[PDB]
Structures are given as structure tokens and as C-alpha cells.
Amino acid sequence: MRIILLGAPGAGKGTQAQFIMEKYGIPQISTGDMLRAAVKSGSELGKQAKDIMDAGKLVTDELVIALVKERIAQEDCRNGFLLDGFPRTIPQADAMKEAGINVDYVLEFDVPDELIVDRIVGRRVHAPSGRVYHVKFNPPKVEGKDDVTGEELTTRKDDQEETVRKRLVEYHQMTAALIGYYSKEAEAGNTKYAKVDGTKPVAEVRADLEKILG
Q1: Radius of gyration of the chain (CA)
Q2: CA–CA–CA angle 99, 18, 138 (5° rounding)
Q3: Which spans are transmembrane here?
Q4: Is position 123 annotated in a ligand binding site?
Q5: How many domains does the chain have?
Q6: Which of 78, 107, 206, 210 has the most CB atoms lying inside 10 A of its own CB?
């Protein structure tokens, strides 16, 4: 069972990761994780990808692909894998096909931008301790203040409404053609594609995956 899980930043597609992992007994894999696990290994690619990172240049599509083919070749991927957040472009996806890395399902965790914004800007945090809150779901006992210390709560620079919005616009701009690519690939029978609605409750989204997957 080989699955590609896609979704906008802050949509929360990771909320179904462990379900898929336990359902079909497969590891979760991201380009970020293997970038490190490669350097950790004495692999040539690891040493290669290490130099590119130390020099602060983007990792080439060919090198990332090589790391992927290397990653899924390991024994933990005997029954498949869960590929999280990759590919991100059509060249990358085609490069996976050019190297014969097919997948069974392409899942698109979909959440409207406005909802994502609403979720994120609602966050509050106690920076020095790292304690997190949220105006809904988990508000502090004393309004605007940390339960433990009683100090005023703040917000992350990474959660600024203006910052989050640019991230989404950028993401859609970069992912739009790729979604159509896999949807068309599905019409060609090369893989299966399904646009999952991530606005419903977790338990409901989970049950929808079982009808899509099996």
C-alpha cells in the first residue's frame, strides 16, 4: 500500500497519518526525514545531500528522487509507505514515474483557506515554557494569561494572519497543476485519486478513508 498524502500548510493532514500507518503497517516518510536519515547513513547520497545543505542551496529534484528510491528500498517499506508532502511539483512527480516509483493512492487533505487562517490565528502561547493554548478548544483559565505562571499570553511570529495567508496563496500557486496531474493520472488508471474533506471531525474523516482505501 503506497500512499501520497497532500494538503495545504496548516490544514492538518497529519491528523490521519498514524491511522493510515497502523491500518496498513507502513512507515511515514517526508523528504525532510530522509534528508537527515541519509546523512546519518554512510550513503553516497547522504554525503552528497549533506554538502548541498551546508552550502544552503536547494536540493535538486534528481537528488531528492534518488533519496526516495533509496528510502523505500529499505525493509521497513516492505508493505508500502506513506509519503507526506511530496511531490510538490509536476517535474518531481514525473521524475518519480521516470524512475518507476508508482503509488496506489493520492489523497488530497482539503481545508478552505479561511478555516485554516481561523484555526491558526486563534493560537496563544506561553513562550518561556512553550505551553500552548487556543481561544477555542483549549482556552486559559484566566483570560489572556498562562495557567501556571499567570503571565500574559502571546502569539507566534509564524502564526501571523498576514504570514499564513501568503503561505497558502504560495502553496496553491505551486500545487494547483500537480493536483490536476494526479487527477488526470487517475483517469488514466495509473493511480487512484481522492479529494478528502478535512473540515469534518477526525473520526468522520477516518471513516471516509476506509471507504476510499479499503
Answers
A1: 19
A2: 130
A3: none
A4: yes
A5: 1
A6: 107
